[PDB]
């Protein structure tokens, strides 16, 4: 269960911490929110091996981009992800949400499903557990929310995704991307379960 939500001050990425092999939980404290640049992050869903390999290559491309042309746009980062996911669609199982903060463009969210298509959205949800919160997220999402409202929106949403999806669980990790900088948040079962 992963999602990225744009708001007034920028964008927040959210994810559960569950990695599975069939019904066995290989890792219950996974970090699915991964840095490809200072203020361009991605949510990883699908194959752990494929999404890691992709994110590592993208981080390499954006580091080499920065050395030559300075800070890349969030759109540029999403384009590099798409290029890898689209051209290798036959050999990849990767559902990636790209989220970044520009000073010009503010918070932006790009979702890249299995096919390798790109979709720029106000917010995005993905992963097995997203199916259960389409109804909830559509009804509760508002544009230009505050930081605290967006954190509550992601927390409540992933709480339900985790509750219904056996493939989702553990802690709720969140990454806040604003002009202020990068803030990591974590929320434990005892809090979010009884929402």
């Amino acid at each position: 269960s992963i999602m990225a939500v744009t708001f007034k001050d920028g964008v927040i990425l959210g994810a559960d911490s569950r990695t599975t092999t069939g019904a066995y939980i290989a890792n219950r404290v996974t970090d699915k929110l991964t840095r490809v640049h200072d203020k361009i992050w991605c949510c990883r869903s699908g194959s752990a091996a494929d999404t890691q390999a992709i994110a590592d290559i993208v981080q390499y491309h954006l580091e080499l981009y920065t050395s030559q042309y300075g800070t890349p746009s969030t759109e540029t980062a999403a384009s590099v992800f798409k290029e890898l996911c689209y051209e290798n669609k036959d050999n990849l199982t990767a559902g990636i949400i790209v989220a970044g903060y520009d000073d010009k463009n503010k918070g932006e969210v790009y979702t890249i499903p299995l096919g390798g298509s790109v979709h720029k959205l106000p917010y995005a949800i993905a992963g097995s557990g997203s199916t259960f919160i389409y109804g909830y997220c559509d009804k509760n999402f508002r544009e230009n929310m505050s930081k605290e409202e967006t954190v509550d929106f992601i927390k409540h949403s992933l709480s339900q995704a985790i509750k219904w999806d056996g493939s989702s669980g553990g802690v709720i990790r969140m990454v806040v991307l604003t002009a202020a900088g990068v803030e990591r948040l974590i929320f434990y079962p005892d809090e979010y379960e009884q929402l």
Binding site: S1, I2, M3, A15, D16, R18, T19, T20, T21, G22, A26, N27, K32, C43, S45, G46, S47, A48, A49, T93, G127, S128, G129, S130, L158, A161, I162, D165, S167, S168
Partner: peptide, 5 residues
Amino acid sequence: XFLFX
């Protein structure tokens, strides 16, 4: 199997 939220 492989590792696969």
